Design a protein around this ligand. Structure first.
Ligand SMILES: NC[C@@H]1O[C@H](O[C@H]2[C@@H](O)[C@H](O[C@@H]3[C@@H](O)[C@H](N)C[C@H](N)[C@H]3O[C@H]3O[C@H](CN)[C@@H](O)[C@H](O)[C@H]3N)O[C@@H]2CO)[C@H](N)[C@@H](O)[C@@H]1O
Ligand SMILES: NC[C@@H]1O[C@H](O[C@H]2[C@@H](O)[C@H](O[C@@H]3[C@@H](O)[C@H](N)C[C@H](N)[C@H]3O[C@H]3O[C@H](CN)[C@@H](O)[C@H](O)[C@H]3N)O[C@@H]2CO)[C@H](N)[C@@H](O)[C@@H]1O
Ligand SMILES: Nc1ncnc2c1ncn2[C@@H]1O[C@H](COP(=O)(O)CP(=O)(O)OP(=O)(O)O)[C@@H](O)[C@H]1O
Ligand SMILES: Nc1ncnc2c1ncn2[C@@H]1O[C@H](COP(=O)(O)CP(=O)(O)OP(=O)(O)O)[C@@H](O)[C@H]1O
Ligand SMILES: [Ca+2]
Ligand SMILES: [Ca+2]
Ligand SMILES: [Ca+2]
Ligand SMILES: [Ca+2]
Lengths: 252, 253
């Protein structure tokens, strides 16, 4: 019947059950256990799942247990300290979406401040990595998206335009999050938090109103809204020094 | 940069061969093969399409990519050792229908020993069990969690996320059906349009896709009905096709 309603107290009872099972199964190879996601922020809603992370002493440990009981869902990630720290210091195009997990850790088990170390590593990422990730996002994501809707304008399909518009607004949100080096609280609040940030690219907020409201059927408006956002991107990047290399026809 | 410019297939192929020559010049006999994938590999590139190319290296553990723009056009070249590429071609993730069409239409431009054919043969020869597992994982990892997200939206918001979530659910359903039929979608723009003409869809999916394809995503009440109907169709569909996971234990490890 899909996920059921659960209270915060029931989810924490489940968490401590998982904690005991982890400690029983892996014992002294467990360095730390934490809850992240909305339960880690103590903002989980009725239908929220449980996300837990485990620091293992075993070197090269990298596995996950993800399951449902038919009523609720749990995900537990098991990483060696090195693998977890290296992932926490790595900045992809979706870093604002993903790395909020290291800012929300509720420690449940910790033998030596490992969860604090993970948090310190995530909040201390060098500014250059956000610069590089922003330039990568423009090339690998926004430029490709611009080709996709320009193709749609000349040859369709307009049936893809609503989905693409959603993706573009999300990519724009990642761009803003990388620029402010702030992680969004949750996925559902990515767009609502993005448009309250300072320093938006021209045309971004207008595009987001289509995605947030769901009024994505006027495909001519959407293409014009995408173009204005794309135009504002070049002005915004030049104004913030996120300059993309266009000088080499073949850069290797 | 003025964004992507109009380019013809002839111009894009001229660019491909310039890249091939530079790859062959730089890596010499460590290049086992070079091929084109994406819409240019299918010779269906549109005016604003970019260029996607693959390269098989003999160097062990080679795994890098060069992706760049000139301000007018964009290129991506992926370099993989044969082993890494054959391994990647034979793993089935939740997004296999989105990603692995690349191995079925490679336009060959350089090949020292049928490596491009070997990649294709590897991609088509994946065991049925790998699709079964990917489908069961997808239900747990993606659909069940999406169901909680829209149920959370109904009770505590935000509805401003609902159009986006609905797009994501339609895409995941498209992966689900593509995994079921072992069909890879052509390009991202055709994922939903091809998913809905597949036989034996879960009940409520085509209606959900009609919301997403038409862009009529402002009626939060109707979307929530539609997501629930599709979620119901999933329970019927998986359970009728044997995509069953044991869910009886509170902690299954
Ligand atoms: N190449 C074979 C294998 O690919 C894997 O990565 C796969 C996937 O992650 C990766 O996706 C990469 C991302 O990462 C990176 N952040 C930007 C890049 N444009 C995107 O590329 C892919 O998605 C784009 C659509 N948005 C497509 O336009 C593009 O043609 C496609 N190669 O491309 C690969 C599939 O083509 C691993 N590298 C490795 O297991 C092995 O190399
Ligand atoms: N965990 C530390 C690091 O995680 C990485 O993977 C990251 C990412 O791909 C991975 O994503 C995994 C997927 O893969 C897997 N196929 C389904 C699973 N629901 C999803 O989980 C992630 O996405 C969900 C939202 N859709 C979130 O609810 C979930 O909490 C989040 N961990 O979770 C990790 C981030 O939390 C690498 N494994 C490795 O660098 C190292 O293990
Ligand atoms: N695609 C993704 N990949 C990796 N991490 C992600 C992710 N999406 C979200 N996250 C990270 O993983 C955490 C848990 O994500 P989710 O379970 O999907 C939503 P949540 O933040 O717990 O709020 P919720 O109550 O709506 O569930 C996020 O808070 C975020 O830090
Ligand atoms: N998110 C993704 N990740 C990995 N591969 C993807 C992908 N999306 C699409 N693909 C694969 O990579 C190839 C190239 O994708 P893209 O360049 O993004 C669109 P295309 O198929 O070339 O048509 P188009 O560029 O004319 O719109 C696709 O044909 C497809 O097999
Ligand atoms: Ca969660
Ligand atoms: Ca989760
Ligand atoms: Ca392409
Ligand atoms: Ca591409």
């Amino acid at each position: 019947n899909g996920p059921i309603i659960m209270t915060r107290e029931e989810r924490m009872k489940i968490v401590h059950e998982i904690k005991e099972r982890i400690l029983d199964k892996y014992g002294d190879d467990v360095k730390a256990i934490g809850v992240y996601g909305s339960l880690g922020r103590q903002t989980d809603g009725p239908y929220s799942d449980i996300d837990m992370m485990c620091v293992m002493s075993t070197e090269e440990a990298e596995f996950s247990h993800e399951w449902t009981t038919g009523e609720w869902k749990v995900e537990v990630n098991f990483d060696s300290e090195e693998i977890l720290l290296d992932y926490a210091s790595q900045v992809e195009s979706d870093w604002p979406l993903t790395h909020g997990q290291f800012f929300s850790i509720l420690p449940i088990y910790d033998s030596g401040g490992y969860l604090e170390k993970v948090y310190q590593t995530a909040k201390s990422v060098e500014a250059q990595k956000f610069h590089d990730a922003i330039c990568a996002l423009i090339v690998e994501e926004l430029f490709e998206y611009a080709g996709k809707w320009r193709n749609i304008r000349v040859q369709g399909p307009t049936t893809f335009l609503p989905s693409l518009t959603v993706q573009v607004a999300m990519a724009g949100a990642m761009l803003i999050g990388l620029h402010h080096r702030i992680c969004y609280t949750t996925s559902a609040s990515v767009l609502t938090e993005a448009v309250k940030q300072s320093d938006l690219p021209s045309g971004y907020d207008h595009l987001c109103q289509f995605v947030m409201s769901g009024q994505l059927s006027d495909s001519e408006k959407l293409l014009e809204s995408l173009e204005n956002f794309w135009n504002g991107i070049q002005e915004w990047t030049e104004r913030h020094g996120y300059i993309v290399d266009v000088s080499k026809r073949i850069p290797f």
